[PDB]
RNA sequence: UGAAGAGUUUGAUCAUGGCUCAGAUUGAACGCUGGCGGCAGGCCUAACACAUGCAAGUCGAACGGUAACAGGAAGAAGCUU
């Protein structure tokens, strides 16, 4: 019962010698509703073939996000070249008021109380890369309680 | 419970990024309308000018007496006895 979505695309088609060339790309996210989120890229000679190749890569493992219960307990750094980025939990009761530019990557797991819109860049790639590569850097309750105990 | 951007300069992209944002809401105002109360507003643009009505009068119980009327009494009469 995994959930499977696009986010972004290119027009990617230029002049040459010689006439014009074109391509078909995709940036997609997948997840599993108990807490697991992931992401994958692709390309083809054709539209859905690129989406296919992209989602097939997105189906890889999916990071179990530290949720307790409907949303998550630390601002884990999504570190990139300035995105910064962080998200902010809301008090488990009001919705996913996140940036529609990157909301996908948390609605594929049904994370119901997290907000923050597109902080330092007007580009959905900038934040969607920044997040998954910094979500792997999360800590469990039992890990923050070893870090401040044993 | 505090936080969904996005049509262009491209011939395709990531940063620099004036602005329209999907209406903030005034001692705010206007056009073409006429089911409706209510709270509250009374000429910002020439502190320029003008009909007309008037913007503290009560009072004598406060020094010398006193005005039309409501009352009385004389003197004069009207015939109203």
Explain what the structure shows.
Pfam families: Ribosomal_S5 (PF00333), Ribosomal_S5_C (PF03719). The chain has helices spanning about 45-60, 105, 125-135, 140-145, and strands at about 5-10, 25-30, 35-45, 65, 90, 115. Helix content is about 25%, strand content about 20%. A four-stranded antiparallel sheet has the order 1-2-3-4. Strands 5-6 form a two-stranded antiparallel sheet. The N and C termini lie far apart (about 40 Å). It has four helices and six strands, in the order E-E-E-H-E-E-H-E-H-H. The relative contact order is 0.18. The protein has about 150 residues and is an alpha+beta fold. The chain binds one RNA strand of 81 nucleotides through loops.
SSE order, one letter for each helix or strand:
EEEHEEHEHH
Helix content: 10-25%
Overall, the morphology is elongated
Strand arrangement within the widest β-sheet reads: 1-2-3-4
Entry keywords:
23% helix; Ribosomal_Su5_D2-typ_SF; RNA-binding; Small ribosomal subunit protein uS5; ribosomal protein; ribonucleoprotein; alpha+beta; antibiotic resistance; 1 chains
Topology:
Layout: E1 3-8, E2 24-32, E3 36-44, H1 47-58, E4 63-64, E5 88-89, H2 104-107, E6 114-115, H3 124-135, H4 141-147
Antiparallel strand pairs: 1-2, 2-3, 3-4, 5-6
This protein binds one RNA strand of 81 nucleotides through loops.
PDB class: ribosome
Keywords: Ribonucleoprotein, tRNA-binding
Entry title: Structure of the E. coli ribosome in the Pre-accommodation state
Please give a quick description of this structure:
The chain has about 150 residues and is of the alpha+beta class. The chain has four helices and six strands, in the order βββαββαβαα.
């Amino acid at each position: 019962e995994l959930q499977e979505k696009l986010i972004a695309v290119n027009r990617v088609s230029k002049t040459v010698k010689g006439g014009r060339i074109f391509s078909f790309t995709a940036l997609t996210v997948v997840g599993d509703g108990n807490g697991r989120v992931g992401f994958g890229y692709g390309k083809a000679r054709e539209v859905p073939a690129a989406i296919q190749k992209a989602m097939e890569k997105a189906r890889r493992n999916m990071i179990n996000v530290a949720l307790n219960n409907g949303t998550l307990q630390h601002p884990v750094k999504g570190v990139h070249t300035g995105s910064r980025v962080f998200m902010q939990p809301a008090s488990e009761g009001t919705g996913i008021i996140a940036g529609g530019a990157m909301r996908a990557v948390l609605e594929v797991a049904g994370v119901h109380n997290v907000l923050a819109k597109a902080y330092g860049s007007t580009n959905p790639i900038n934040v969607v890369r920044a997040t998954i590569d910094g979500l792997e850097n999360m800590n469990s309750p039992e890990m923050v309680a070893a870090k401040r105990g044993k």
